[PDB]
Write a protein that holds these residues in place. Structure first.
Motif, short mmCIF file in Angstrom:
data_model
loop_
_atom_site.label_atom_id
_atom_site.label_comp_id
_atom_site.label_asym_id
_atom_site.label_seq_id
_atom_site.Cartn_x
_atom_site.Cartn_y
_atom_site.Cartn_z
N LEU A 68 0.82 -1.22 0.00
CA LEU A 68 0.00 0.00 0.00
C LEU A 68 0.86 1.27 0.00
CD1 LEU A 68 -2.73 1.60 0.14
CD2 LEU A 68 -2.60 1.30 2.61
N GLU A 69 1.82 1.36 0.92
CA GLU A 69 2.78 2.49 0.92
C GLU A 69 3.46 2.69 -0.45
OE1 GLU A 69 4.25 2.57 5.57
OE2 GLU A 69 5.69 3.09 4.00
N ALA A 70 3.90 1.59 -1.06
CA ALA A 70 4.62 1.68 -2.32
C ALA A 70 3.72 2.15 -3.46
CB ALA A 70 5.27 0.34 -2.68
N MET A 71 2.50 1.62 -3.51
CA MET A 71 1.54 2.05 -4.53
C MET A 71 1.13 3.49 -4.34
SD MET A 71 0.85 -0.16 -6.80
CE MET A 71 0.94 -1.91 -7.07
N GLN A 72 1.03 3.94 -3.08
CA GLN A 72 0.75 5.36 -2.80
C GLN A 72 1.92 6.21 -3.28
OE1 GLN A 72 -2.08 5.55 1.14
NE2 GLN A 72 -0.02 4.69 1.48
N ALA A 73 3.15 5.74 -3.03
CA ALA A 73 4.33 6.42 -3.57
C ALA A 73 4.32 6.41 -5.11
CB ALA A 73 5.60 5.80 -3.04
N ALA A 74 3.91 5.29 -5.71
CA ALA A 74 3.90 5.16 -7.17
C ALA A 74 2.91 6.17 -7.76
CB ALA A 74 3.54 3.73 -7.58
N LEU A 75 1.73 6.29 -7.13
CA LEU A 75 0.72 7.27 -7.56
C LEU A 75 1.27 8.71 -7.54
CD1 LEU A 75 -2.17 7.93 -8.56
CD2 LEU A 75 -2.91 8.11 -6.17
#
Ligand SMILES: [Cl-]
Ligand SMILES: [Cl-]
Ligand SMILES: [Cl-]
Ligand SMILES: [Cl-]
Ligand SMILES: [Cl-]
Ligand SMILES: [Cl-]
Ligand SMILES: [Cl-]
Lengths: 172, 172, 172, 172, 172, 172
Positions: E93-100
């Motif tokens: 979740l953290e990584a996908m939020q960073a990716a966004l």
């Protein structure tokens, strides 16, 4: 003198260059006809495509004269290509009567060049004109003549239904 | 006006007709280059064929403008096609430099047309220009520049061997 | 705002919803034309099928807008789909005349949406409209215009033989 | 009266038009559910596609009523398609419950039409409804009920994990 | 000035170089995420591969900008590629939020460049950015947004079972 | 400590992170060479593609160290990637000479790492370096040395025809 030049008179070289121009003029006139029949207020697409095809044919004939010039050691000299006689072509019958006229003009020019080649005793040029131009020229004239007869049979220019049927059945 | 016409300004219609003519002019210039390189005293057949293919490309660009005019309900109006600037093109390098200048002339005309279509708020015309013309223009200008760089690297105009090698290795 | 939303103005979002409804209205109108030409006392099956296909085309255009809305983080808001303006469409020429008018209405709405997208500096929405709607619109308008020209040439509305020929040869 | 009309009561004709509209209203409701599940803040793609498929199914059902009306010599009369009851559908369980209710509403209307056809002694209409509608209705209601049972088993609406698993395994 | 350069402003050339560095930076960030999810104490291999594929995508985007620079006669000037913002990325979740966040940063930089190209009247640059970048950006942002919604539905970051299922069903 | 870590010294872990970065540095340097030989005023496409391929190769090498780090239970720590030494690479000979020195630098770093792994008694690391890195290094160094000898035989920098010939004959 070109190293490959043999039995190729200056008069014939000049005549080949004029003939090439006339082929390009014919090609351009045919392009104009294509554009006319493709108009939304004309809308005879098979007729348009017939004339597009003849535009391409006449362009190929001009390119063959370029290649011929170089094969004989003559020099290609280009001139402007005059715009077509008309911007609008009336209807299928008017345009076909104009194509007949144009074809006969081209044919007469080829016959003139053939007579010049005979007079100058250039059998290679005579043979080229016979094989690559005179035959197709007679075929094209007959085809257009046949079309004209059918368009008149179909009631052109007055008969709109007849003009529709021609587009659907004679140039499909 | 035409029953199909919508959002098509008369200035843009007129500019499309001028663009069509310029494409035909470029096609004719390339045909002249083809004939030059096919001469017995020049004899660079691959170079000749490169220009022949570009003559075909530019002619297809003109025909697409004719079709486009009719799609939008404009009217195709043809003008004379002026003869090319030169009868003789010197050598492969001179010819490529002349080709670069021609391509940049056609490119500026296309960008000028895109700006007019933008000012006139015609997104259909902008999009047509972008997809069908603008990207091929840039591609064609990059290729020709690349060719000039190589010809200069090969020692043209003086290095006949360099010229022979370009014709065998750089073009189709 | 939606987590995906970027550079998407509320005005454009609202206009996309209006555009979706207009496409559904157009689809529904074409559906009515299909059902009319499928009547036993009209019975022009190829004409009916032409409108059925355009109904299905317009519905797909509305669906594309729904997906576009979600892609940009906008929210699809549906409204009632108004019934078509007529229950009976007269004949093939009146129906095509109505279809041309409808297509021009839809086209103007897409052009107005593109202008808004331009003004609001949304190039993603501009590009979507150009690539997915504007091109297709001009093609559809040209085809319908060509049809009307040919229907008039065939003597519509009075000429039933002409209408029969059109159904057999222009649509399919 | 239509030349083809035989044993087709005006009440049945009118009822077929109402049924046609109801099927379209169902189709539009399903379209709305598809758009909801495709939202970035919902993102259940298979659920979205299931509803898209049902939207398509119901539109086909409406189209079949159009064709039927013409077959019997009745006359299609179209009405506005009302917008769906909600803009947002909550979650997969709420949407499935809504779909069940919609499906039972359409089923009751088909059943009421079949009763009218029976009363008016129209076996062709009875047979059409049985073959083309009644069987599919019972299958769709059973499928949706099974889905609702499974969504409750999976702890909807509170259990997000259950909802994810449903979208991966119960819908195709 | 480069022989191929035409209508290509120095501000745009500079902005293209900055844009390709940003693409490289994004590529490197995605590679870091790949390396994190492949750790024996994280072990979410399909998540790792998703990030690896996106690292590759952004690398290709930068290379397309290098090729573009040369096509227009601009000059590629490379700068250091900054290390990613974090050495470890917490969880999916953290990584996908960073990716966004990263994707929206890249998108904004592309939109800025498109606006500059519009202002400088460079339709070739505009068209390139639309077709090759803006479309894919929007799709990538939607996909990542969808994933975030699903990770939140599956109980991230607290729900370890949810994270396992996302890896098995939403990616690869 | 990682649950998988066995016989993996911290010094070796750090050295692998340094090695990773130098492979990225090398990859970026080859990308710079690719872009240089793709310039319109350089235009040696095959040479440009050679350097693009080697850019890919070094990137793959960097990825493989990331994976190796994780397999052994080490932790990937990324650092900035420094821009290449030059923005412009002169000509094919200068570029190859620079490539040789770069390859030697990478090879010395790998030998230094092998030596550390030997002293720390890590045969897994030694074996990985031997099979995955040291042999291809020696092959790549031999290839570039062979190229340099040939470029000198061909008369670079001054012999433009020599440079053209190498691009057409020595590189793929
Ligand atoms: Cl002689
Ligand atoms: Cl007529
Ligand atoms: Cl009866
Ligand atoms: Cl879809
Ligand atoms: Cl909501
Ligand atoms: Cl300029
Ligand atoms: Cl997109």
């Amino acid at each position: 003198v070109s190293q490959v030049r043999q039995n190729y008179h200056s008069d014939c070289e000049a005549a080949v260059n004029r003939m090439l121009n006339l082929e390009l003029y014919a090609s351009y006139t045919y392009s104009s006809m294509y554009a006319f029949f493709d108009r939304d207020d004309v809308a005879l697409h098979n007729v348009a495509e017939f004339f597009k095809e003849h535009s391409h044919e006449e362009r190929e004939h001009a390119e063959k004269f370029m290649k011929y010039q170089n094969k004989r050691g003559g020099r290609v000299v280009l001139q402007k290509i005059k715009k077509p006689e008309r911007d609008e072509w009336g209807n299928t019958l008017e345009a076909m009567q104009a194509a007949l006229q144009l074809e006969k003009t081209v044919n007469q020019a080829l016959l003139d060049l053939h007579k010049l080649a005979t007079d100058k005793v250039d059998p290679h040029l005579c043979d080229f004109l016979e094989s690559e131009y005179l035959e197709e020229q007679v075929k094209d004239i007959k085809r257009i003549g046949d079309f004209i007869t059918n368009l008149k049979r179909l009631g052109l220019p007055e008969n709109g239904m007849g003009e529709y049927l021609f587009d659907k059945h004679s140039v499909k």
